Amino acid sequence: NRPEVAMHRNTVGLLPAHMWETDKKTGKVKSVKDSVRDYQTKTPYPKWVQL
Amino acid sequence: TATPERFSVLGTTHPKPKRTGFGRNNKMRSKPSDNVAWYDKGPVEWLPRPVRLTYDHLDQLQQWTMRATLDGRTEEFNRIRDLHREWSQHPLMPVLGDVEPKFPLNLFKQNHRAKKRFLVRWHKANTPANWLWMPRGPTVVTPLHRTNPTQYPENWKQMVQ
Amino acid sequence: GVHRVGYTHPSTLPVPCAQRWDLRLARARIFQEYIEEKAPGAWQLEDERSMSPEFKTFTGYPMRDMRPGYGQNLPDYIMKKRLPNNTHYELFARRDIPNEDNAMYGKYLYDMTVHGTSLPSTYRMHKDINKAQRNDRKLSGNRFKVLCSSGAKNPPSGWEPIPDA
Amino acid sequence: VSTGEFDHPPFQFRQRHTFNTTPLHDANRFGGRTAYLREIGPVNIKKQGRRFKKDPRTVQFNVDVWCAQQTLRKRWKQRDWEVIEIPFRLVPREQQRVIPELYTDIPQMTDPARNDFSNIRNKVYDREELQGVLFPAAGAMLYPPLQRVDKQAMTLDKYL
Amino acid sequence: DNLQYKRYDWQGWYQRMLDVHNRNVSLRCRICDLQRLDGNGVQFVDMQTERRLRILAQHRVGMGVLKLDADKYEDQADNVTFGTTKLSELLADARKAQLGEEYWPSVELKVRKPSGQSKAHYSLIDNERIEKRSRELYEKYRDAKKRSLFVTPMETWLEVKGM
Amino acid sequence: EDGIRGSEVTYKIVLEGFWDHHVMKLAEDVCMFLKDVGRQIVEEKLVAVRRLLQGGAVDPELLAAFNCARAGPFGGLDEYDKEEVANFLRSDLRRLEEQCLSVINRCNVPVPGATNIYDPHTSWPHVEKLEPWVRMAEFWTSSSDTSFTELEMSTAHYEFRKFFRVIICKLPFQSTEFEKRMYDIRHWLHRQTSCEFHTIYRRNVIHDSAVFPTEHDPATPTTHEHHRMFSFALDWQSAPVNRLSTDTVHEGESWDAVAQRLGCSVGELKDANAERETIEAGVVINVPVTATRRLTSFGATPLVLPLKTTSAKDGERIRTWEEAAAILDCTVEELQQCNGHAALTYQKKESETELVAPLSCWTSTSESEFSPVERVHANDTLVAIARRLQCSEEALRAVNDGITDVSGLDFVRVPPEARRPRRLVEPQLRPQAATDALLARTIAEEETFKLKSIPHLPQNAERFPHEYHTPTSRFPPTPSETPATQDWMAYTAKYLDKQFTISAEPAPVYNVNKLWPMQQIPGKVDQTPFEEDQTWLLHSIPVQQLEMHHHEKDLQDLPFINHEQFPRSLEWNAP
Amino acid sequence: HFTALLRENRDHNGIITVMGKPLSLVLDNKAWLMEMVLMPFDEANLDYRDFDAHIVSEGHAMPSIANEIAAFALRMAVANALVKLIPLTRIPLKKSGLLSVDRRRERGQFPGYLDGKKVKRRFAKR
Amino acid sequence: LKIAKSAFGFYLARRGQRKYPFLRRPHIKNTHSMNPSAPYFWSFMTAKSQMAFLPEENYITGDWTGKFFVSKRQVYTLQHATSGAKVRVKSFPSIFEFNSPSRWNIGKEMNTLTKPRMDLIDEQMLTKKQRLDYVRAGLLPK
Amino acid sequence: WAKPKKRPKVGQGFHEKAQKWREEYLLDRHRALADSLRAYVEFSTSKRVEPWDARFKPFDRIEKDGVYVLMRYMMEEKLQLCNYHHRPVKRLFCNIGLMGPQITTKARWKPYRFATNPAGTSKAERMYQRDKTVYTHGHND
Amino acid sequence: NTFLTSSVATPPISVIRTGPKWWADPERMVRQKLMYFTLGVDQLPLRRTAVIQRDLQRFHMCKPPPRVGDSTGYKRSRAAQLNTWYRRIQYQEYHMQHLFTRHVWGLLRVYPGNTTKIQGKADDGYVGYDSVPFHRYNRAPLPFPARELYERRK
RNA sequence: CCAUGAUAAGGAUUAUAAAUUGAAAGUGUUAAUAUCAUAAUCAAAAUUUAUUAUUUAUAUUAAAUAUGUAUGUGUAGAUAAAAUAAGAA
Ligand SMILES: [Mg+2]
């Protein structure tokens, strides 16, 4: 949710915390793990498309 | 992906400097200035900050004053009356050859900041405690006003015989 | 407040009559009208400026509609929109051109009919006349430039240029 | 004839808090709505700003919307009534006519013959006198009938 | 154009431009001449037919005159055609008010909110039940007041669902 | 109307120069000219009129034209004798003389010392002023690359002007010759001066109840849905709708069986068909155009071709395409258009169950067209229903089984005998088979790729209100509803005190419009304009951020660039 | 631009009205504005209650005409009316300089100036 | 213009520091195109609706021999990462390349992933005077 | 109008330097973005100071009386649910209706940047102590 | 009080020089008078001011009376005397107003603009929610939330 | 790319009445000197240029894409504008 209307409705469940690497002391994000290699999706295109 | 251990060209470039001063061109120092008030002189800070009296405030004033009348409180009335009596005394006529100093010509160009600076400092120098042309003190006789609480109408029962 | 809009069919009433919504639909058939279903009822705003005799700017019509987010990209905007065909953009398109009379007629035509011949532009003519006047004193500051080189590079079987000094 | 502010004051040298002068986007203007137009602080022209917030035309448009809202709001707090669609036969005699739509003809007088000259558009009717028409089903009247004051009756104001 | 664009190549497209700029045809008729005896003896446009007409065409009516502006086509011929079509169509619908009362457009009355005199009875609604109740509520209050300092209406007659 | 105020044909000539006195003097000239040509023409029409008044015959044709009404004002077919008709004619001609004399007399007022051509009483034609067109050009007179300041300080104001006089001539009749001289005045027009011609004349239009009939509303209503964007291009035909003037007689029929079927008198049917003395089964007949029950082309019921026992080609099942293309009289490609299933499985229709005839071949029956049933109002009697449907009370009674009181009934069955019926669905609507004929390829590809649905939104989308905004969406967003909210009595009843007797404050049976003047789609949840300032300020209504757009005004670009195609007076009024 | 319609009230209840609104509300209760409109009835040595005036705005219309300049205009209007009604009253009015028209305008708008009116742009030595 | 950085330097005058009507400047140079926003990430310098289709430039329109750089308004798609093909954008000095794929790019324009004004400043394209001035600004060290 | 002087040549190895700089500028921007989204959502979820100004009324009044009563018993759960962010707080106060018209007109609320401070904030300096490495637009703790 | 922000203070004579525009703007003078009157206190100084200024405005389009050549400079000295007298009466007024308004705000539970004195409540200028985190002229740090000058109940 | 022309900016003593507070002395593009070369916007783009009035603390990103940075005692030097429906002696 953008700041305007619903902002307080955001949840920590939207956070992909498993994607990055964090500093224990600062509670801040130092590095990012690699996205593309291990990425598995049954749906590159939407389900309803058959090429 | 996979954030690098080093950045070759990123942190390599010359860092931008933190500005030394503020205001115009980031060159102006932090110091005491003309706009500074003094809280040590008189009831009103000097030079006086802008003040806005709103009709809203007037109606609040009215309800306060009424409610004060009805509770038989003569105190704040008497404070106010004293203040008025002290500062409203008619300013004396100044003697020939007494005028407020102007800024002398041919010092700076006409467009220059010196002018205002001089005005501001001269007035900052004369606080209302320094106004000797208005007669405030225990010495002064005040023909137009009542002297103390006894003489005001809410004391009227003492005035009867 | 927030309510559900409602409609009482004329069969249900203890006197039949034409409901105003019905008429609205009759009208929308006759002059074809897009009913905007998502139109908020809370947004009715007369445009103060142009619709009130109080402001010097008063046209008696709703000059603009006041919607802050309105933009040219929206589909509804495209439905009520004027097309550039046969508007001033066209008149500009056709009558504003570098040599004005090339709007009135083909140049070659005009010239061939009036003069017996086609005539150069004045600028070209300046170039030429100067070529003449200055070839008549100095020479060989020059260069021979053309569209096609094959005419000078193999000249015909005759063609023996007169030697010069 | 309103004395309020319809116009966004033009941009100039920065106005600062003074006797007789306040900042341009100061909270006190337009009921606080200038919050929407405000870029706070010593703004860096080269790197920072939001262009629309210094632009005369845009700002002024936003203000015009805001004013329109205020007026709308006040004309709708002005209403004590609803529009009810009542079939031609049942309705009071002065409405039995033809009534052109808004801005179509001259503003029309209700009943010039009976000495009421007033806008029929703005004529409002009491929910009490339409009771029998509006709630036929209910039988016994759900609103008790209006008590009216006798103008010929001798009362305090008549000096009796 | 008699002036400039009169006689050369541009004369054609200018002329055409002007004709397509002017393609508007205005079509008027008074509503006084629509009220006449039709060939079957019925009055063609009567009071309700006019009411339905006026609500049908909104701003297309003024001063008791119906005026249709047909711009749809590039040429004036087709706009008289289009205009006459929309007119006979609008009359076709507006005539429905002669079929019976169910088509007579409703009158829109501004009916006031219930007046003050009637709004007063709003405090006496269900009077007895409320008084006899208020005593028991006073009891529950007098008892709740022994335990705690402040007694909410939510501890008495008000229900707030917990979950 | 008399004197100045009224005319048959009004011409307005708008003259435009570059200099004021140019157009003024021009107006004087053209005006004098039209004064003389005007006098001439109107004089001639006057001598004609005077002759006509002195005496003359009456048309057979005019006489006929007076006598055509079924019933005139006195409630019977009226006989106008030629005397009376001549009396009408004479009245109107007397009026025409009045107006001719008016014009001619005005023409003779403006003598040299006394000429004033602005006032309409003093001269014909007269002249109105029209506000001059004035455009101010504002621009840099410096060529400087160096400094903005200096460019600004150099700014010149110049203007283009165009000046307009308008010439008004109101005439009591329409002469082609006057129009000719008048259109011709453009050829001797002054130097650098142009003109416009506004003609406003009177013209008989004709309203047919034949082509644009007056009918009851459909027994199915039309929703807001028939009106979306491009509903104009898809869901509707262009009026008038096509009604058949030709009809085939069914077997067991007689003249008035057919007449009672078509909704007309027997006489009528005999006269439109006057050629034929008798009507056998299977013959084509002319529907009298005043008939009530006339059918629309292609009734909404699709013609269906079952496979069944067919031709002698099998006597079992129909197989190849062009066989059915011969059966239904269409090209094979149409039949392939309509059936997307039977095209994609195969051409030999292997396994397929049926076929759907192209829209062109469908036939309407009075059974599919007109609703068999009728809705009964609260106050209804059989008398009223009978009047509404034009039927005799007894025929209604028969189909309705002698019922007397209609109160317990929502619906009453309509006699096939009735004159004014209800159509099953709006005629001017576009049958769906057409719009589907447009889209045929896609409807095939929907089956091929097996598309059940294409989601327009992400899965969780309504969890985030401000993020997904289609460009049909509008602020302020309307809140989800609540049951007891609409007024205080209901609220009190459901929430605060639950023993409350009155569950809702009195609700007037008739419709209450809470958004007004604004009309709104019924059954939709909506909001009312906000009274409380807070409700405005604290809502999600955005502010204008980018450049702003007007649908019309975008073409003439900015306020500062004001594009104009033609220099018409800003006041200029389309006739 | 204002136009005063002036008539004489034999009932001694006079009132002045601007664009259909009572003068009190239009000039908005500011006394120093309204006294200006009173003045010509003083200079003519007349009673204001004997006269009804309604004033019409022919210029740029605005939500509020209350301000001294518009007041000045109003005064001039009423005065000229009064002279048309009571001819000899023109002598005192003229001497008191009511009937006098001053010609003053805001400077025309102009791009050369910063604020659009009086202020020339910034100057820097090369 | 003073220095000719292109063809047009011959044709154009700067005319001092000169104001243009709102949101119309002749030469669009988006200096702000990459301007980090966490909360506004999907609404800033992107499609005004999430329901819009990708632009023309996300698709091969005709029979192409091939291209050098794809246009900067082409949105980064999951395939841009996965496929492992050359993705080129025309920036200055020459071309920018998406070499090191990441899923954090997806669904934004490469108008947004390419910094228009770099903090890296070559001194080989600068006049000695220009270098002096950049030193004034506290950009170049000296 | 001086004849424009020609621009000097590009440079050598600069194309690779620039490719590299932009490349790793983006790979940095990824952790910039990640960190800032964490900070933003974290802000969104965590509690804030009270958005109203206790120097005006209907707020100055003692916390045992008036508005606060209306807040304690009726509104409490709702206010704590939205973590006192000023937008839903003000909106809830609008919808409670027992204050009704005053929320905007009479009542007064802390300026935007002050109302944004974390719960338990003591000194005003806390406005400038928030992390500057993160791009939330002042929406981070 | 609505306008809370830090402010820029003008010297009195420049405030007075605004004449009919602000200092003497009829409207403002009236609501000041209303203040005094409501307090049960005469307005003498205000009345002197309005006398002086009413006259100033009346004659503002006229030329000053002829100045004949003096070696002595008495016309100059005397008209100057008169002038600084008037200035001084108006200083008395300007002071008076600022005073009474700070006091009356003191009774009305009102918070002033930033860095303003209220005689009995905030001796050092009062501040809350300034653009700057420290007290401007104290160079002392500011507490959050804004400092409260008055006891709670209203 | 050498290849003449021509219009800007720039307040210093003809005044008040029935009246204008903007000037000629020349600021890229314009007509007779020719003898290196195709450099021109139809989108989405690279800061070094004397010659430019930006929003400063109750509420703050929705339609062409629209600016992330500088809180620091209204604070150095030096600079800008105005006597025109306004109010200056
Ligand atoms: Mg030159």
Task: Describe the protein in words.
Chain G: This is Ribosomal protein S9. Chain D: One of its GO terms (cellular component) is mitochondrial small ribosomal subunit. The structure is cut from a larger assembly and holds 10 protein chains of 10 kinds. Chain B is mainly alpha-helical and 161 residues long. Chain B has helices at 55-70, 75-87, 114-125. The termini of chain B are far apart. Helices cover 33% and strands 2% of the residues of chain C. Chain H has helices at 78-82, 128-136; strands at 3-4, 87-89, 96-98. At the I-J interface, loops of I face loops of J. The structure holds magnesium ion. The structure holds one RNA strand of 89 nucleotides.
Helix and strand arrangement:
The structure is cut from a larger assembly and holds ten protein chains of ten kinds.
Chain C: E1 2-4, H1 20-30, H2 48-51, H3 75-79, H4 88-95, H5 107-114, H6 122-135, H7 150-153
Chain F: E1 9-17, H1 20-54, H2 60-66, H3 82-107, E2 126-140, H4 148-153, E3 155-171, H5 176-184, E4 194-200, H6 231-234, E5 246-248, H7 255-262, H8 266-272, E6 284-286, E7 304-306, H9 321-327, H10 332-338, H11 341-344, E8 354-356, H12 366-369, E9 373-375, H13 382-389, H14 393-399, E10 411-413, H15 432-438, H16 440-448, H17 488-496, E11 512-513, E12 525-527, H18 533-537
Antiparallel strand pairs in F: 1-3, 1-4, 2-3, 5-6, 7-8, 9-10
Chain I: E1 5-6, H1 14-45, H2 67-81, H3 86-96
Chain H binds one RNA strand of 89 nucleotides through helix 2.
What is the count of helical runs of chain I? 3
Q: Number of helical runs of chain A?
A: 0
Count of extended strands of chain A: 2
Give the H and E element order of chain I: EHHH
Profile the largest sheet of chain I: none
Described by the principal axes of the CA atoms, the overall outline of chain A is flat
Alpha-carbon distance between the termini of chain A? 34 Å
Series of H and E elements of chain A: EE
Q: For the largest sheet of chain A, list the strands in their spatial order.
A: 1-2
Which structural category do the helix and sheet elements of chain A fall into?
mainly beta
- The overall strand count of chain I is 1
Strand content of chain I: under 5%
PDB class: ribosome
Keywords: mitoribosome, translation, Trypanosoma, small ribosomal subunit, 9S rRNA, ribosomal protein, mitochondrial initiation factor IF-3, ribosome
Entry title: Cryo-EM structure of the Trypanosoma brucei mitochondrial ribosome - This entry contains the complete small mitoribosomal subunit in complex with mt-IF-3
Chain A: mS49
